[PDB]
């Protein structure tokens, strides 16, 4: 519980003590982890799920055969942490959506009830299939900054870790976001430890270095200003959520250290 939430508000720097908010466990959490212990109790499908991956991570990334198989979704904020996060209340709308590295689509739907277009974009096909089973409208990586319209609101969630450019994409998301009303929903695992995901266990190294240095989660932290800044960007809130992930055979779900930020563009 408090282990996922807590701060030591007194090791972050003058501007992040003022921006951060707390963030609790609340009900849409407590869902996600239930439905996701009923899930792992299905010891069989399980089984079926764990041997096929087994085979097809031979020629297949993790992230496409948890597409294929409709498993491992996970969870970053509720409809209400998000709500409060962003400061909206819940009938807040606007007109464009963007999710970088979208997935499935399941934190995406968090999200989606307050836009009236969506768009999406991921690298697995199987994923692809996901986002398009939610009618979302799927961009190639390199076609959303060349649209001809800007975005509302740019999500970009546990991805500057998993890409090989994260500082190219944190300039091509300011050139597309709306500069008067437009926001940045920016998640990172801390520690940072990036990597770009292939075949079987296999990962390289990414083009572009994000300076993100730090022992615990608050000196990590501090060092994003700078990064967010390089690309035009101020945090105007942020706070600490479980990034949670469906479990297998041995675990009931999976958990990780997630920092979660709105950006303002300047
Ligand atoms: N260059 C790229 N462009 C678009 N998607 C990418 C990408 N590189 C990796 N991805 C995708 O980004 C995802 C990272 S995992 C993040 C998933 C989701 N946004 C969440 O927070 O839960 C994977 O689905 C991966 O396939």
Same mark, same amino acid.
């Given at each position: 519980?408090?282990?996922?939430?807590? &701060? *030591?508000?007194?090791?972050? &720097?003058?501007?992040?003590?003022?921006?951060?908010?707390?963030? #609790?466990?609340?009900?849409?959490?407590?869902? $996600?982890?239930?439905?996701?212990?009923?899930?792992?109790?299905?010891?069989?499908?399980?089984?079926?799920?764990? $041997?096929?991956?087994?085979?097809? =991570?031979?020629?297949?990334?993790?992230? =496409?055969?948890?597409? /294929?198989?409709?498993?491992?979704?996970? +969870?970053? +904020?509720?409809?209400?942490?998000?709500?409060?996060?962003?400061?909206?209340?819940?009938?807040?709308?606007?007109?464009?959506?963007?999710? /970088?590295?979208?997935?499935?689509? !399941?934190?995406?739907?968090?999200?989606?009830?307050?836009?009236?277009? %969506? #768009?999406?974009?991921?690298?697995?096909?199987?994923? %692809?299939?996901?986002?398009?089973?939610?009618? @979302?409208?799927?961009?190639?990586?390199?076609?959303?900054?060349?649209?001809?319209?800007?975005?509302?609101?740019?999500? &970009?969630? *546990?991805?500057?870790?998993?890409?090989?450019?994260?500082?190219?994409? /944190?300039?091509?998301?300011?050139?597309?976001?709306?500069?008067?009303?437009?926001?940045?929903?920016?998640?990172?695992?801390?520690? $940072?430890?990036?990597?770009?995901? *292939?075949?079987?266990?296999?990962?390289?190294?990414?083009?572009? %270095?994000?300076?993100?240095?730090?022992?615990?989660?608050?000196?990590?932290?501090?060092?994003?200003?700078?990064? $967010?800044?390089?690309?035009?960007?101020?945090?105007?809130?942020?706070?600490?959520?479980? @990034?949670? &992930? !469906?479990?297998?055979? #041995?675990?009931? @779900?999976?958990?990780?250290?997630?920092?979660? +930020?709105?950006?303002?563009?300047?």
């Amino acid at each position: 519980n408090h282990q996922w939430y807590v &701060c *030591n508000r007194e090791k972050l &720097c003058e501007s992040l003590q003022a921006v951060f908010v707390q963030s #609790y466990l609340d009900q849409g959490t407590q869902i $996600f982890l239930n439905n996701s212990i009923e899930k792992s109790g299905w010891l069989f499908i399980q089984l079926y799920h764990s $041997f096929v991956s087994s085979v097809f =991570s031979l020629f297949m990334s993790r992230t =496409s055969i948890n597409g /294929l198989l409709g498993r491992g979704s996970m +969870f970053v +904020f509720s409809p209400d942490q998000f709500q409060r996060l962003l400061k909206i209340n819940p009938d807040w709308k606007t007109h464009r959506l963007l999710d /970088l590295g979208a997935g499935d689509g !399941e934190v995406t739907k968090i999200m989606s009830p307050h836009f009236e277009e %969506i #768009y999406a974009t991921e690298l697995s096909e199987t994923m %692809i299939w996901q986002l398009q089973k939610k009618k @979302y409208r799927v961009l190639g990586i390199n076609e959303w900054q060349n649209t001809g319209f800007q975005y509302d609101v740019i999500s &970009c969630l *546990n991805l500057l870790d998993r890409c090989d450019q994260p500082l190219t994409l /944190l300039k091509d998301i300011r050139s597309v976001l709306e500069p008067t009303r437009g926001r940045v929903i920016l998640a990172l695992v801390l520690p $940072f430890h990036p990597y770009v995901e *292939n075949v079987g266990g296999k990962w390289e190294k990414p083009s572009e %270095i994000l300076e993100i240095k730090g022992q615990n989660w608050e000196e990590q932290v501090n060092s994003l200003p700078e990064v $967010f800044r390089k690309a035009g960007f101020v945090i105007e809130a942020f706070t600490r959520l479980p @990034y949670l &992930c !469906e479990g297998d055979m #041995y675990n009931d @779900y999976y958990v990780l250290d997630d920092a979660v +930020f709105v950006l303002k563009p300047v």
